[PDB]
Amino acid sequence: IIGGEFTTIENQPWFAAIYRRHRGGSVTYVCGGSLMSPCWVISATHCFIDYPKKEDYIVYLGRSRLNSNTQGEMKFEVENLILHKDYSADTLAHHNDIALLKIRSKEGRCAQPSRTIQTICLPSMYNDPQFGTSCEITGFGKENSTDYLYPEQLKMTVVKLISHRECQQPHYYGSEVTTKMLCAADPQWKTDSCQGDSGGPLVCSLQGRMTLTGIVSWGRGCALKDKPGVYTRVSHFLPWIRSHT
Numbered sequence: 001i002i003g004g005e006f007t008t009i010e011n012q013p014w015f016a017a018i019y020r021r022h023r024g025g026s027v028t029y030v031c032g033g034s035l036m037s038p039c040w041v042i043s044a045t046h047c048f049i050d051y052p053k054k055e056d057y058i059v060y061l062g063r064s065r066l067n068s069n070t071q072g073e074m075k076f077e078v079e080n081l082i083l084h085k086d087y088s089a090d091t092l093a094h095h096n097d098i099a100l101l102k103i104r105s106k107e108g109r110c111a112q113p114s115r116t117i118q119t120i121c122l123p124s125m126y127n128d129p130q131f132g133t134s135c136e137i138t139g140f141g142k143e144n145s146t147d148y149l150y151p152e153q154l155k156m157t158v159v160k161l162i163s164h165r166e167c168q169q170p171h172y173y174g175s176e177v178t179t180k181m182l183c184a185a186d187p188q189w190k191t192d193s194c195q196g197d198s199g200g201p202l203v204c205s206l207q208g209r210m211t212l213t214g215i216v217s218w219g220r221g222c223a224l225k226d227k228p229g230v231y232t233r234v235s236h237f238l239p240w241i242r243s244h245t
């Protein structure tokens with residue numbers, strides 16, 4: 001996260017920290033995810049496409065720091081790794097950048113909801129917030145684009161939604177941004193998600209209920225003028241999510 005505020009997991013109980021073991025033992029942080037149900041997490045396909053081996057991934061819920069064990073956390077493994085069978089990656093735009101990870105503890109059980117391990121609801125068919133609506137993104141991604149280390153503590157910021165036609169103007173993303181993606185950014189471009197936050201939860205309070213409206217997908221640079229953060233429009237992939245669960 002660029003700008004924003006530091007925070008603890010108790011404020012984002014649906015945030016999943018996904019790391020991956022490397023040949024040799026060392027483990028690094030990959031992307032963030034969202035707890036769909038006790039047994040399922042939903043992320044982005046571009047965080048796994050190049051390393052499709054489910055065994056390599058580790059996932060935590062209720063973890064507040066990057067290299068600390070938060071009281072209340074749970075360490076999981078990826079029972080099933082499902083990548084959208086129609087995904088592709090152009091110069092900037094990432095297509096059908098949505099994946100699923102069926103989790104499982106060493107004992108074989110799924111996630112046990114708690115004060116710091118809860119779920120977020122999927123949006124309903126044909127019902128997304130209007131443009132200009134404030135929403136929030138969470139993650140352990142970069143604080144600045146010139147850095148190389150991820151922040152040690154969890155962060156989060158609030159951004160606004162940008163309409164499809166406004167996002168397709170030339171100085172933005174032209175015909176690269178399609179209708180199965182949502183744009184969102186700070187009107188003053190001082191804060192924005194960034195590398196590290198990919199596949200992060202984009203929660204928007206719609207008509208009263210906190211909703212998972214988008215997954216962090218792509219953007220030009222980070223917090224740059226006329227360069228909104230693009231996300232996957234979850235409402236569209238509802239039939240897909242249903243049949244693959």
Ligand SMILES: N=C(N)c1ccc2cc(C(=O)Nc3cccc(OC4CCCC4)c3)ccc2c1
Binds near residue numbers: 198
């Ligand atoms: N501006 C944002 N809000 C934002 C939001 C998301 C961002 C993601 C990456 C990034 O580096 N993503 C990434 C990481 C690993 C691989 C990858 O692409 C592969 C998938 C298909 C071809 C190579 C992208 C970089 C910058 C990002 C910036």
